[PDB]
Antibody, heavy 216, light 210 residues
Framework: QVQLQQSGAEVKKPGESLKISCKGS????????IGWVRQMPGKGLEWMGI????????RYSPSFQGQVTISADKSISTAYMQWSSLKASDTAMYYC?????????????????????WGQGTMVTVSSASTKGPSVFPLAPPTAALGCLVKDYFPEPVTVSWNSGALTSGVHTFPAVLQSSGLYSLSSVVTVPSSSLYICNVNHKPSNTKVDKRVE | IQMTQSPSTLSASVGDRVTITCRAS??????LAWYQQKPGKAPKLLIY???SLESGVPSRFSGSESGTEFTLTISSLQPDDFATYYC?????????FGQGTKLEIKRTVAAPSVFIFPPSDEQLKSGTASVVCLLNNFYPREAKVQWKVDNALQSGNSQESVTEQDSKDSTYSLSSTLTLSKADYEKHKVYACEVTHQGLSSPVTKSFNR
């Protein structure tokens, strides 16, 4: 199978250096251009630059020239992107992608075409915050709404279930928002018969936090 | 080169013929690609060189060009096709993408059910107060929430979050959180969120006294 495998998610502090990787399998890595593309949270796709691993010829968007270094190790079919000094605004999903070619067998590829193979993305989060478990507060109530406010944690994600997974109809768990404090917050709600008047199960893997809060 | 997509969102139904457009600010020849992306997943290439169908992509996708205007057509929309679509020019460096067109599932108007939640006394012992307004199972996505603290419009101190279209009923839900210092929270009486939505004849207000 033709694939690009990217390195795992990274949570870093500003100023730190970071190198992420993109490993090709199932094709001649040195015969195709590799591009890097950024997607900031909630935004569109932005092209950062490209490299031809066969000779390490590189081009950078003016917006990223001098902020990142793109490189390749052809001996192990891996391309890299490296920051010397991460900024908070580098928080984004980063994709590597291969450019299409009809015939890879000709030695000179010509300019980079459309991206036909995409890596699965590497999430990079840059923040001065430290790992911190959530505080969980109840959202107290024919139909009644109730919920849990999961506040002030870092980094993403938390998972939320209701009644240990037995209660799934009518549940809405909202996307986290980043607060100006630099910590995240989300809420999870469920609607239930007002006649039945409930425990939300919050897990935050980074802090090893588990909280089961009764909402009365 | 600026790539502009239109419309920004499109609501359609399974079996619809849909077209979405991409205009380049100058000639890009035919070096135009179209991509599909689903939430949290990597893009997938659909069309390259303006009209060439990527191997393995169903032929219900087609691309065409008229000058600087490029069109992506889906001839019969299927459930897998609801997604965001991006165009990209690769005529000249830097390569640039359109801002995306989200294709969503059309359904009938549904007014939101609105709920307001005061801060818990647990949280008040912490120094901050979070007031939460829930807009449940509504359609279309466009809604507005305004926070009212003793009749004074709030600005800059709320954040909101929206779910993706519900897998079963194609509605949206939204939560807005008003954040106040507990000092400011103590100094006022009435807290209200005011909800405006196409499904509502007039704005709905849920409120409480501290």
């Amino acid at each position: 199978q033709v694939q690009l495998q990217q390195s795992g998610a990274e949570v870093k502090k500003p100023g730190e250096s970071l190198k992420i990787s993109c490993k090709g399998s199932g094709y001649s890595f040195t015969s195709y251009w590799i591009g890097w593309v950024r997607q900031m949270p909630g935004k569109g796709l932005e092209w950062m630059g490209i490299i031809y691993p066969g000779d390490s010829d590189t081009r950078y968007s003016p917006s990223f020239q001098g902020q990142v270094t793109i490189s390749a190790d052809k001996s192990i079919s891996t391309a890299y992107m490296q920051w010397s000094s991460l900024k908070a605004s580098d928080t984004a999903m980063y994709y590597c992608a291969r450019s299409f070619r009809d015939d890879p067998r000709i030695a000179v590829a010509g300019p980079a075409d459309a991206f036909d193979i995409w890596g699965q993305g590497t999430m990079v989060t840059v923040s001065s915050a430290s790992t911190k478990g959530p505080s969980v507060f109840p959202l107290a109530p024919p139909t009644a709404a109730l919920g849990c406010l999961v506040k002030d944690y870092f980094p993403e994600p938390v998972t939320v279930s209701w009644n240990s997974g037995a209660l799934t109809s009518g549940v809405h768990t909202f996307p986290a928002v980043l607060q100006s404090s630099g910590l995240y917050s989300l809420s999870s709600v469920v609607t239930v018969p007002s006649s039945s008047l409930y425990i939300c199960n919050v897990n935050h893997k980074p802090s090893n936090t588990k909280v089961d809060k009764r909402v009365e | 080169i600026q790539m502009t997509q239109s419309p920004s969102t499109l609501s359609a139904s399974v079996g619809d013929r849909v077209t979405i457009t991409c205009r380049a600010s100058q000639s890009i020849s035919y070096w135009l690609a179209w991509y599909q992306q689903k939430p949290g997943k990597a893009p997938k290439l659909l069309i390259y060189q303006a009209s060439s169908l990527e191997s393995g992509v169903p032929s219900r996708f087609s691309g065409s060009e008229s000058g600087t205007e490029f069109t992506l057509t889906i001839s019969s929309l299927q459930p897998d096709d609801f997604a965001t679509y991006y165009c990209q020019q690769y005529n000249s460096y830097p390569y640039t993408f359109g801002q995306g067109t989200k294709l969503e599932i059309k359904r009938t108007v549904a007014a939101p059910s609105v709920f307001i939640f005061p801060p818990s006394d647990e949280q008040l012992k912490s120094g901050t107060a979070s007031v939460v307004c829930l807009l449940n199972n509504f359609y279309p996505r466009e809604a507005k929430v305004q926070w009212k603290v003793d009749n004074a419009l709030q600005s800059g101190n709320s954040q909101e979050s929206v779910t993706e279209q519900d897998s079963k009923d194609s509605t949206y839900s939204l939560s807005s959180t008003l954040t106040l210092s507990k000092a400011d929270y103590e100094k006022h009486k009435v807290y209200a969120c005011e909800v405006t939505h196409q499904g509502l004849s007039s704005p709905v207000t849920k409120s409480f006294n501290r």
